């Protein structure tokens, strides 16, 4: 969660 990176709207990471 504290690692995630949101590129943009709708795409989510980690």
């Amino acid at each position: 969660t504290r690692k995630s990176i949101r590129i943009g709207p709708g795409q989510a990471f980690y």
Epitope: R2, K3, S4, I5, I7, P9, F13
Partner: antibody, heavy 124, light 116 residues
Framework: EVQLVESGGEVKQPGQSLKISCKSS????????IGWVRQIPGKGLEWIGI????????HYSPSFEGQVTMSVDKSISTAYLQWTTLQASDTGKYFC?????????????????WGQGTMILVSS | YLLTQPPSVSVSPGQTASISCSGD??????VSWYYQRPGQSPVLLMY???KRPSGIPERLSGSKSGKTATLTISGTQSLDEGDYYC???????????????????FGEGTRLTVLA
């Protein structure tokens, strides 16, 4: 305070190795990703790579993968980029930064914190 | 892709400068804007298309239509002269797999001249 503090400016020779330091403080060093951007001054900004100090998952820019290496050392909360072998292109002002998780409603990310920059002059 | 920006921009004092940023994916990628004075370090101005980070004045505003994102500064002043960079990302799972590849692209920047 919240600040990244970086090693001083070096004048290196082509083919010399190199390793620069970015010490971090004011937050949890492992929970926020660390960044490395270059300033080829007069020219643009040039992103190099990210690493997560907790596990060291990285993402190298496809232009430094192979010529540059990013590491972290947690006990001294310090992030490192290093060359095995320099070259005149490797010249420039190296900034390390901190990637912030803006836990907004719909979340996003960005670089709110920046080291003073280490200046590297590669020449003979 | 890549982020494109006007190498330079001019606004007369007290007036509105617009700085654009064009990318082939920006139709669907959060843009962020940075400040830099010669010699000094980059400053976050804007993130997630429009979100001003704290301490950054309401006179600066951020928008993005299509594959184009715009930094707008009203009430311009000598204190605004410097360079401004749009940034964004890019991912891509490998077709062979092996995870998801992340990339941070920056525009080349816009020297803002305030015609004092």
């Amino acid at each position: 305070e919240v600040q990244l503090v970086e090693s001083g400016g070096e004048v290196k020779q082509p083919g010399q190795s190199l390793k620069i330091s970015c010490k971090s403080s004011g937050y949890n060093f492992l929970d926020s990703w660390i960044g490395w951007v270059r300033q080829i001054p007069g020219k643009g900004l040039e992103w190099i790579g990210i690493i997560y100090p907790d596990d060291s998952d990285a993402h190298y820019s496809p232009s430094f993968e192979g010529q540059v290496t990013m590491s972290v050392d947690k006990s001294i909360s310090t992030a490192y980029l290093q060359w095995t072998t320099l070259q005149a292109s490797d010249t420039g002002k190296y900034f390390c930064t901190r990637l912030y998780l803006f836990e907004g409603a719909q979340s996003s990310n960005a670089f709110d914190l920046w080291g003073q920059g280490t200046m590297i002059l590669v020449s003979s | 892709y890549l982020l494109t920006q006007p190498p330079s921009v001019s606004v007369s004092p007290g007036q509105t400068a617009s700085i654009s940023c064009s990318g082939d994916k920006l139709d669907d990628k959060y843009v962020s804007w940075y400040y830099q004075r010669p010699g000094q370090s980059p400053v976050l101005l804007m993130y997630q298309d429009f979100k001003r980070p704290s301490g950054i004045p309401e006179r600066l505003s951020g928008s993005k239509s299509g594959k184009t994102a715009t930094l707008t500064i009203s009430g311009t002043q000598s204190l605004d002269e410097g360079d401004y960079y749009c940034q964004a990302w890019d991912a891509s799972t490998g077709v062979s797999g092996g995870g998801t590849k992340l990339t941070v692209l920056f525009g080349e920047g816009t020297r803002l001249t305030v015609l004092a």
